[PDB]
């Protein structure tokens, strides 16, 4: 099975540099090209460049010559991309893919790079209880960086709302809808995990 | 009109991901913008020099088993 | 550079229908065009190579066509699982360039939103903050208006709206609206109202609470 392994996320400050890896397995690394792509939300994908491990050939999209540096290590079957003089415009998901005559075939899971001066911050978790089905929720406010998970009743029980910036910090919410016979008679809890801050907060939803 | 001065190889010719050959040239003439003279098949639609300073990428499909750019004309073997 | 134009940012299709997504190249790229499918939170998946060849494992419902400058991806018998962004890519010459993508929306019967309002919690109020939350859940079509009112007067300052992607499970949309005030300003008012205007009703769907 062809696999291109990339780290999930990188958090970096403006003006810094970041180096990400693309570890290839399930095929002969030196026989195929590797492509690098940038994807910003609601934006057109861009091709940064390509690399041929079998020959050492590197081609850059001229738009990224002042931003990206592509390298390889045939001994570890790994391709790397370094992005330097980082700005908020560099915040994006960066994909590697295997290439050749049929273009991008298998793509990596992508590395989500956040460029920000914001400090890693744990979320404040607020219950959302009303003042036949009942809708409940949890408001997950003032955290950094992305992302969080909101789990309802140890995953037994939903809408996850995409995070918004408010301001240099994220805020998201999650709703759950249950029959009015299960709540408040039985406990409904939201479990909020923020791996970046080593936090896990449970909020039991109370009536009133 | 066609470029009348000298071209220099800015990088050794290499094979691309899509099976063409990539030829990076730098122009030395005063007459830019101009059309690059090319003779052996040309893949680049309108190979043109925009500015003297700016190198330009030319792509070609080489036949099985010599390339001439300019008119001391740049010579390339594949 | 070669420009790959996908003129349709969004395409809406009923379950079982055929949809054709176009990709127009700024110059002749012969048959060096690939098509990818991308679902939210996933990496792109290769569908079509060299304009018309289906990748192994790709269903026969997906067909690529065209050469030169006009390319089309056709999806027949559209299913709930086809909800995704589809994009083209030219690999005729460097730099490789992608089309802007086309988001495929699945069309279905109307669904009225389930509207719920929530007062700020005691925990938030202890920190000097107050967020009033309104969920507008499982509605269709996507177009919706949310209006906030404080003691009957329209409030626009401090409202932040978050929209989900179309749900693959039921083809509906959901939205959360949050009105953030200071604890001080929140406690100077009594009634908080969230109103949703949608195709499904002439009069807005109103949800409110009174602090008293």
CATH of the domain at A164: 2.60.40.10
Q: Does C28 touch chain B (CB under 8 A)?
A: yes
**Quick one: A123 and A179 in the same domain?**
yes
Distance from C-alpha of B14 to C-alpha of A55, rounded to nearest angstrom:
9
Q: What is the DSSP string of C146-185?
A: EEEEETTEEE-TTEEEEEPPPPTTTS-EEEEEEEEEEHHH
What is Dmax (Cα atoms) for chain B? 36
Is the CB of A101 less than 8 angstroms away from the CB of B16?
A: no
Å between C91 CA and nearest CA of chain B? 7
First-to-last C-alpha distance (Å) of chain B = 28
Distance from C-alpha of A204 to C-alpha of A152, rounded to nearest angstrom:
10
Q: Does B46 touch chain C (CB under 8 A)?
A: no
Rg (CA), chain B: 12
Q: Does B18 touch chain C (CB under 8 A)?
A: yes
**Quick one: A14 and A88 in the same domain?**
yes
Residue keyed to tokens 């057109």:
A44
Distance from C-alpha of A115 to C-alpha of A18, rounded to nearest angstrom:
10
Question: Distance from CA of residue C160 to its chain's centroid?
Answer: 17
CATH number of C108-211: 2.60.40.10
Mark out chain B residues that contact chain A at CB-CB < 8 A. Answer: 14-19, 22
Rg (CA), chain A: 22
Chain B residues lying within 8 Å of A35, measured CB to CB: 17
Q: Does A131 touch chain C (CB under 8 A)?
A: yes
First-to-last C-alpha distance (Å) of chain A = 54
Chain B residues lying within 8 Å of C93, measured CB to CB: 18, 20, 43-44, 59
Per the structure block, which two tokens stand in for B42?
């040309």
Chains contacting B (3+ CB pairs below 8 angstroms)? A, C
Nearest CA in chain B to A31: B17
Is the CB of C120 less than 8 angstroms away from the CB of A162?
A: no
Residue keyed to tokens 């914001």:
A118
- 3-class SS at C212? coil
Å between A35 CA and nearest CA of chain C? 10
Give the residue from A36, A52, A65, A97 with the most B CB atoms within 10 Å of its CB, the best one to mutate: A52
Domain end (from A92, A117, A142): A117
Count structural domains, chain A. 2
Q: Which residues of A46-75 are buried (b: 16+ CB within 10 A; e: fewer)?
A: bbbbbbbbeeebebbbeebeebbbbebeee
**Strand C10-14 versus strand C102-107 pairing type:** parallel
Is the CB of C43 less than 8 angstroms away from the CB of A109?
A: yes
Q: Which domain holds residue A50?
A: 1-117
Nearest CA in chain C to B21: C93
DSSP-derived letter for residue A118 is P
Contact C65, C52 (CB under 8 A): yes
Is the CB of B15 less than 8 angstroms away from the CB of A101?
A: no
Per the structure block, which two tokens stand in for A47?
């091709």
Nearest CA in chain C to B43: C93
Rg (CA), chain C: 23
**Quick one: A6 and A109 in the same domain?**
yes
Q: Does A59 touch chain C (CB under 8 A)?
A: yes
Å between A22 CA and nearest CA of chain C? 14
Give the CB-side neighbour count of residue A127, counting CA atoms within 13 A.
17
DSSP-derived letter for residue B62 is P
CA distances A166 to C88, C128, C160, Å, are 35, 16, 9
**Quick one: A106 and A199 in the same domain?**
no
Nearest to A101 among B14, B18, B22 (CB): B18
Fold of C1-107: Immunoglobulin-like (2.60.40)
Is the CB of B18 less than 8 angstroms away from the CB of A55?
A: no
Number of cross-chain residue pairs from A and B with Cβ atoms under 8 Å apart: 19
Q: What is the resolution of this structure in A?
A: 1.8
Distance from C-alpha of B38 to C-alpha of B35, rounded to nearest angstrom:
9
Nearest to C160 among A61, A159, A164 (CB): A164
Chain A residues lying within 8 Å of B17, measured CB to CB: 33, 35, 50, 52, 59, 99-101, 103
Contact A79, A48 (CB under 8 A): no
**Quick one: A79 and A127 in the same domain?**
no
Contact C71, C51 (CB under 8 A): yes
Å between A106 CA and nearest CA of chain C? 7
Chain B residues lying within 8 Å of C69, measured CB to CB: none
Q: Helix H segments across chain C?
A: 122-126, 183-186
Residue spans of the domains in chain B: they are 1-78
CA distances A144 to A73, A82, A123, A202, C82, Å, are 33, 24, 8, 18, 33
Distance from C-alpha of A120 to C-alpha of A196, rounded to nearest angstrom:
7
Residue spans of the domains in chain C: they are 1-107, 108-211
**Strand A111-115 versus strand A9-12 pairing type:** parallel
Domain end (from A63, A93, A117): A117
Per the structure block, which two tokens stand in for A10?
């990188």
Nearest CA in chain A to B24: A59
Q: Torsion-angle region of residue A198: left (phi > 0), alpha (psi -120 to 50) or beta?
A: left
- 3-class SS at C102? strand
**Quick one: A111 and A190 in the same domain?**
no
**Quick one: A64 and A163 in the same domain?**
no
Residue keyed to tokens 């918004």:
A164
Chain C residues lying within 8 Å of A40, measured CB to CB: none
Per the structure block, which two tokens stand in for C73?
């991806």
Distance from C-alpha of A24 to C-alpha of A97, rounded to nearest angstrom:
9
**Quick one: A67 and A167 in the same domain?**
no
Is the CB of A175 less than 8 angstroms away from the CB of C127?
A: no
Is the CB of C121 less than 8 angstroms away from the CB of A127?
A: yes
CA distances B48 to B12, C10, C55, C64, C168, Å, are 20, 37, 37, 33, 49
Q: What is the DSSP string of C50-73?
A: TTTEEPTT--TTEEEEEETTEEEE
CATH architecture, range B1-78: Sandwich (2.60)
**Strand C4-5 versus strand C19-25 pairing type:** antiparallel
């Amino acid at each position: 099975d062809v696999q291109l392994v990339e780290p999930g996320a990188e958090l970096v400050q403006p003006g810094a540099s970041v180096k990400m890896s693309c570890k290839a397995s399930g095929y002969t690394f030196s026989s195929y090209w590797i492509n690098w792509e940038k994807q910003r939300p609601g934006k057109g994908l861009e091709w940064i460049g390509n690399i041929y491990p079998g020959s050492g050939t590197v081609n850059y999209d001229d738009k990224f010559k002042s931003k990206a540096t592509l390298t390889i290590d045939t001994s570890s079957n790994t391709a790397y991309m370094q992005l330097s003089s980082l700005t908020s415009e560099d915040s994006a998901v960066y994909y590697c893919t295997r290439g050749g005559s049929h273009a991008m075939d298998y793509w990596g899971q992508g590395t989500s790079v956040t460029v920000s001066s914001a400090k890693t911050t744990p979320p404040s978790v607020y219950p959302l209880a009303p003042g036949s089905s009942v809708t409940l929720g949890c408001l997950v406010k003032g955290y950094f960086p992305e992302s969080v998970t909101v789990t309802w009743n140890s995953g037994s029980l939903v809408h996850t709302f995409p995070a918004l910036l408010q301001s240099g910090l994220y805020t998201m919410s999650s709703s759950v809808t249950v029959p009015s016979s299960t709540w408040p008679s039985q406990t409904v809890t939201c479990s909020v995990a923020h791996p970046a801050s080593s936090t896990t907060v449970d909020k039991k939803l109370e009536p009133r | 009109a066609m470029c009348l001065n000298t071209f220099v190889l800015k990088k050794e010719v290499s094979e691309t991901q899509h099976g063409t050959i990539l030829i990076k040239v730098e122009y030395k003439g005063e007459d830019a913008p101009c059309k690059i003279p090319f003779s052996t098949r040309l893949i680049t639609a309108n190979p043109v020099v925009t500015k003297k300073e700016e190198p330009v990428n030319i792509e070609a499909e080489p036949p099985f088993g010599n390339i001439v750019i300019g008119i001391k004309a740049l010579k390339i073997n594949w | 550079d070669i420009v790959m134009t996908q003129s349709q940012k969004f395409m809406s299709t009923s379950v079982g229908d055929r949809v054709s997504i176009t990709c127009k190249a700024s110059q002749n790229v012969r048959t060096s065009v690939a098509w990818y499918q991308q679902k939210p939170g996933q990496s792109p998946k290769a569908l079509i190579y060299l304009a018309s060849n289906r990748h192994t494992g790709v269903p026969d419902r997906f067909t690529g066509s065209g050469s030169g400058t006009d390319f089309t991806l056709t999806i027949s018998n559209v299913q709930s699982e086809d909800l995704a962004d589809y994009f083209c890519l030219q690999h005729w010459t460097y730099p490789y360039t992608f089309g802007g993508g086309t988001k495929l929306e699945i069309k279905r019967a109307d669904a009225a939103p389930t509207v719920s309002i929530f007062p700020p919690s005691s925990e938030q109020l202890t920190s000097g903050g107050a967020s009033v939350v309104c969920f507008l859940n499982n509605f269709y079509p996507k177009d919706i208006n949310v209006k906030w009112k404080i003691d009957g007067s329209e409030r626009q300052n401090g409202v932040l709206n978050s929209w989900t992607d179309q749900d693959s499970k039921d083809s509906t949309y959901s939205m959360s609206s949050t009105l953030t005030l200071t604890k001080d300003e929140y406690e100077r008012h009594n009634s908080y109202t969230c109103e949703a205007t949608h195709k499904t009703s002439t009069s807005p769907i109103v949800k409110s609470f009174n602090r008293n």
